[PDB]
Amino acid sequence: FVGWSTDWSPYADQSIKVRISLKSALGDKAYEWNDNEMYLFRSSVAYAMRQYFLKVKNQMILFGEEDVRVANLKPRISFNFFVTAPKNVSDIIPRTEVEKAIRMSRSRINDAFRLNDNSLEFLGIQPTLGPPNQPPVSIWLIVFGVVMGVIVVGIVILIFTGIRDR
Amino acid sequence: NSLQFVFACISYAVGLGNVWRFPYLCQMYGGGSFLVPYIIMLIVEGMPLLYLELAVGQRMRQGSIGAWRTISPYLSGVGVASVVVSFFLSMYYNVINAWAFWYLFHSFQDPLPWSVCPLNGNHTGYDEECEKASSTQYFWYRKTLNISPSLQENGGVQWEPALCLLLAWLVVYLCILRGTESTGKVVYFTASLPYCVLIIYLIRGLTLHGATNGLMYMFTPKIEQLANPKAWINAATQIFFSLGLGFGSLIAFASYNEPSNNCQKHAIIVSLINSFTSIFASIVTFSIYGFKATFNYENCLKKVSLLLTNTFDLEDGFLTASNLEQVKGYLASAYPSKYSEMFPQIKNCSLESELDTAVQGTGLAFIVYTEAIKNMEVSQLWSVLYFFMLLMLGIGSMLGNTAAILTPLTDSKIISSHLPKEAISGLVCLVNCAIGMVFTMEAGNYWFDIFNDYAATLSLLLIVLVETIAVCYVYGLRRFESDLKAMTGRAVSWYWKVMWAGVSPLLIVSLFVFYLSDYILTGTLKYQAWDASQGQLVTKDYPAYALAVIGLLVASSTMCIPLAALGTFVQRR
Ligand SMILES: *[C@@H]1O[C@H](CO)[C@@H](O[C@@H]2O[C@H](CO)[C@@H](O[C@@H]3O[C@H](CO[C@H]4O[C@H](CO[C@H]5O[C@H](CO)[C@@H](O)[C@H](O)[C@@H]5O)[C@@H](O)[C@H](O[C@H]5O[C@H](CO)[C@@H](O)[C@H](O)[C@@H]5O)[C@@H]4O)[C@@H](O)[C@H](O[C@H]4O[C@H](CO)[C@@H](O)[C@H](O)[C@@H]4O)[C@@H]3O)[C@H](O)[C@H]2NC(C)=O)[C@H](O)[C@H]1NC(C)=O
Ligand SMILES: *[C@@H]1O[C@H](CO)[C@@H](O)[C@H](O)[C@H]1NC(C)=O
Ligand SMILES: *[C@@H]1O[C@H](CO)[C@@H](O)[C@H](O)[C@H]1NC(C)=O
Ligand SMILES: *[C@H]1O[C@H](CO)[C@@H](O)[C@H](O)[C@H]1NC(C)=O
Ligand SMILES: O=C(O)[C@@H]1CCCCN1
Numbered sequence: 001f002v003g004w005s006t007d008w009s010p011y012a013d014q015s016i017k018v019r020i021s022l023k024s025a026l027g028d029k030a031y032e033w034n035d036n037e038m039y040l041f042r043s044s045v046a047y048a049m050r051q052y053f054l055k056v057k058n059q060m061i062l063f064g065e066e067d068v069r070v071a072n073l074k075p076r077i078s079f080n081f082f083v084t085a086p087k088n089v090s091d092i093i094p095r096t097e098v099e100k101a102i103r104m105s106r107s108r109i110n111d112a113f114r115l116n117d118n119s120l121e122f123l124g125i126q127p128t129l130g131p132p133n134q135p136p137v138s139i140w141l142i143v144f145g146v147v148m149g150v151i152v153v154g155i156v157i158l159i160f161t162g163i164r165d166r
Numbered sequence: 167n168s169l170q171f172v173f174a175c176i177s178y179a180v181g182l183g184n185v186w187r188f189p190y191l192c193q194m195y196g197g198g199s200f201l202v203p204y205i206i207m208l209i210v211e212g213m214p215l216l217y218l219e220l221a222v223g224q225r226m227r228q229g230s231i232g233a234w235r236t237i238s239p240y241l242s243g244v245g246v247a248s249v250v251v252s253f254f255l256s257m258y259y260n261v262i263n264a265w266a267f268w269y270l271f272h273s274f275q276d277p278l279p280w281s282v283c284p285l286n287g288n289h290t291g292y293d294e295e296c297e298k299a300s301s302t303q304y305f306w307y308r309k310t311l312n313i314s315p316s317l318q319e320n321g322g323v324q325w326e327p328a329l330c331l332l333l334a335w336l337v338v339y340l341c342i343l344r345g346t347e348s349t350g351k352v353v354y355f356t357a358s359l360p361y362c363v364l365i366i367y368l369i370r371g372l373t374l375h376g377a378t379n380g381l382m383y384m385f386t387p388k389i390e391q392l393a394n395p396k397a398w399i400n401a402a403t404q405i406f407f408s409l410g411l412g413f414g415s416l417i418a419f420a421s422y423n424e425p426s427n428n429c430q431k432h433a434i435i436v437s438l439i440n441s442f443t444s445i446f447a448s449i450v451t452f453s454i455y456g457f458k459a460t461f462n463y464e465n466c467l468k469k470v471s472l473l474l475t476n477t478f479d480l481e482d483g484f485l486t487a488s489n490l491e492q493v494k495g496y497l498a499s500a501y502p503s504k505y506s507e508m509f510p511q512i513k514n515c516s517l518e519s520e521l522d523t524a525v526q527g528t529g530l531a532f533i534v535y536t537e538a539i540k541n542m543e544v545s546q547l548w549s550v551l552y553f554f555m556l557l558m559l560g561i562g563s564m565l566g567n568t569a570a571i572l573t574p575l576t577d578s579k580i581i582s583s584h585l586p587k588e589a590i591s592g593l594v595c596l597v598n599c600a601i602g603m604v605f606t607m608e609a610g611n612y613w614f615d616i617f618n619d620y621a622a623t624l625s626l627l628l629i630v631l632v633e634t635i636a637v638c639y640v641y642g643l644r645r646f647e648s649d650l651k652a653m654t655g656r657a658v659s660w661y662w663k664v665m666w667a668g669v670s671p672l673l674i675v676s677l678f679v680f681y682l683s684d685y686i687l688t689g690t691l692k693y694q695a696w697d698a699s700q701g702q703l704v705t706k707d708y709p710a711y712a713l714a715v716i717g718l719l720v721a722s723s724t725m726c727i728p729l730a731a732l733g734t735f736v737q738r739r
């Protein structure tokens with residue numbers, strides 16, 4: 001292939017792509033995605049990184065809103081962000097750790113924007129719906145047993161009474 | 167005495183053929199394209215032949231076999247055959263009741279089984295087949311029947327449907343043993359509860375989004391598919407199966423009536439009430455069906471819009487259903503290199519195709535009404551109420567059919583002098599339940615399809631044809647008219663004579679000829695089969711062994727007449 005693309009970089013593997021759908025989850029009464037919303041999103045991501053590094057690796061790292069670098073913003077509200085070291089740009093947190101951090105505190109990020117796991121897609125982090133706990137044994141089997149028992153008792157008593165009468 | 171007889175006939179006629187069979191028969195054959203022949207086949211075939219049955223029941227004042235033997239010995243076989251058909255009906259009809267029982271027992275759960283699809287296995291999404299189809303369709307085809315992909319593939323006897331069928335037959339036997347004349351308050355109750363439940367479901371069914379689409383599909387008589395002879399055949403056979411013509415129990419019911427009674431009013435009233443009940447139930451069912459089709463169309467449009475938006479980086483709400491083609495053209499005009507990749511992937515969906523292929527088959531009523539229940543507020547109560555109305559209808563119809571089966575057996579002194587009637591009825595129920603286990607297999611729904619379409623479908627036409635020729639030409643229509651006039655004071659109207667003598671037999675013969683010609687020209691009988699991978703219904707040719715059963719079911723009952731004639735001729739010589 002002759003030529004080059006101005007979008008590939010050796011550190012582009014560590015980027016995480018976010019896609020946001022404001023007008024589908026909220027319909028009306030939906031805020032616009034201006035720079036303040038991006039600031040809040042970067043603050044939320046930095047908070048998630050702090051929580052992960054505090055509750056797992058037991059390291060106190062002072063992330064900030066400037067350590068979540070964002071590119072390729074588009075009217076769909078779909079961009080690519082990566083989290084670097086607190087005061088050292090050359091160091092990029094590997095994508096696995098960022099994904100674990102997002103998984104740990106995805107509910108808080110969802111609540112900060114009033115989105116629910118479908119209008120805030122991280123394109124690589126998929127949520128878990130939750131196991132559908134089962135009733136004790138089976139309601140239908142119990143009901144069928146009761147009905148069959150009463151029907152059999154009725155049949156037996158009717159046959160016995162008819163035989164005894166004649 | 168008029169109320170007793172009229173309500174007995176109504177309770178016999180109004181059953182699962184009105185609420186269950188009519189909706190899916192209408193859906194299968196084009197909706198309006200099926201409704202126009204139905205009415206056309208009701209004025210010509212329903213009323214005159216029902217009136218003829220009731221008059222033969224009165225003027226003979228004997229049973230079916232007794233009447234058709236007293237008219238002429240060479241004809242007594244048509245009394246025997248009219249029993250055999252009932253047998254086959256009672257062989258499979260109960261399966262429907264079993265299904266309702268199943269759907270009742272899975273109605274006391276907060277997470278209704280047909281409401282939410284099971285988890286895929288990652289615990290992050292839904293099942294592939296449960297997503298391609300609906301939750302109701304997945305429950306009906308997999309959780310209820312566990313239908314095999316083809317008729318050639320069958321497993322063992324599914325124990326849950328077998329137990330449900332056993333319970334239904336036990337209930338029928340208990341109803342047989344318990345009551346025979348205590349239907350006093352029942353006729354006051356069992357005739358209004360189905361109408362009340364259908365009224366409730368109509369009140370819900372006419373406020374759903376896109377209900378008018380369903381009504382428009384129901385009432386539009388598409389001329390293109392109106393030329394199908396199978397539609398006319400199915401309309402006539404459904405009329406006969408819903409009125410009970412050919413089963414021979416209407417003759418027995420009219421045998422107990424006074425000869426100074428108006429059977430012209432009663433026949434007209436019964437036929438009109440049956441037609442109105444069928445139309446009302448089908449209206450509710452098709453309103454819910456139209457809601458389903460509209461929902462599927464909207465879902466497909468939303469999926470296509472989401473597919474385009476996630477790729478072209480369009481705004482969240484920019485791409486709507488009102489500006490889809492234009493934006494598609496705009497996107498295509500913007501750059502074709504990107505559009506070329508996914509052009510196969512973009513799917514075309516329209517209301518018409520969804521309406522033809524949303525839901526179809528013998529489970530149309532169950533799927534549609536479970537969907538409607540899942541869209542209620544207290545789903546459990548409405549599900550219980552509907553599947554209890556359905557249970558009452560099925561139980562009443564089966565009581566009528568089994569009485570028609572059993573009366574000749576009880577009247578036979580050879581059997582009545584050896585075993586009690588309680589044992590004869592027990593043996594009949596046991597034989598029927600044991601034979602009906604073939605409908606509980608993995609491929610049992612296909613055998614149910616065969617019996618629902620051939621066991622009591624065309625034999626009822628030939629039986630009624632033989633009966634009307636017997637009444638008109640062998641007995642003598644002038645003698646019959648004189649006897650009826652002496653019995654009731656009023657001579658039969660000229661219209662009834664015209665429909666008895668020439669019009670109805672000629673129409674039946676023409677229908678038979680058209681059906682035979684169509685079958686010969688096509689040369690390939692096909693059935694619908696579930697496809698879970700595609701999640702829809704596909705057409706497959708019947709195997710070699712399924713045609714033998716299809717032929718025998720009709721052949722035994724129909725050929726029981728000429729064999730009896732040959733036997734009588736041999737006995738004479
Ligand atoms: C901001 O963040 C950035 C991150 O982006 C951070 O920059 C990093 O800083 C660290 C610390 O200084 C650097 O680590 C140093 O790397 C020096 C480079 O020389 C080595 O380079 C190769 C590294 O590969 C390592 O890992 C592989 C895989 O595990 C392993 O196989 C290697 O052996 C090595 O451990 C390495 O290949 C290379 O090889 C030499 O030797 C081989 C024979 O083994 C020979 O064949 C080669 O030809 C070559 O000669 C070489 O080893 C390295 O010199 C340096 O090591 C010295 O110090 C350490 C102690 O710190 C001693 O243990 C060691 O013996 C040496 O004395 C150290 O490893 C890292 O490279 C930077 N990364 C980048 C991208 O810049 C900044 O520091 C941050 N800034 C702030 C302010 O925080
Ligand atoms: C979810 O399950 C499917 C199999 O149906 C599998 O292909 C896919 O990789 C699974 N997803 C994840 C995140 O593991
Ligand atoms: C949809 O319509 C287009 C144009 O009529 C056609 O080329 C295509 O085959 C159809 N089906 C799909 C799945 O795209
Ligand atoms: C899905 O599963 C994950 C663990 O695999 C769990 O943390 C998460 O809470 C689940 N989602 C629910 C229960 O809604
Ligand atoms: O409408 C029904 O379901 C019944 C079936 C048996 C004959 C009478 N009609």
Ligand SMILES: [Cl-]
Pocket residue numbers: 183184188404405408440441444
């Ligand atoms: Cl009908």
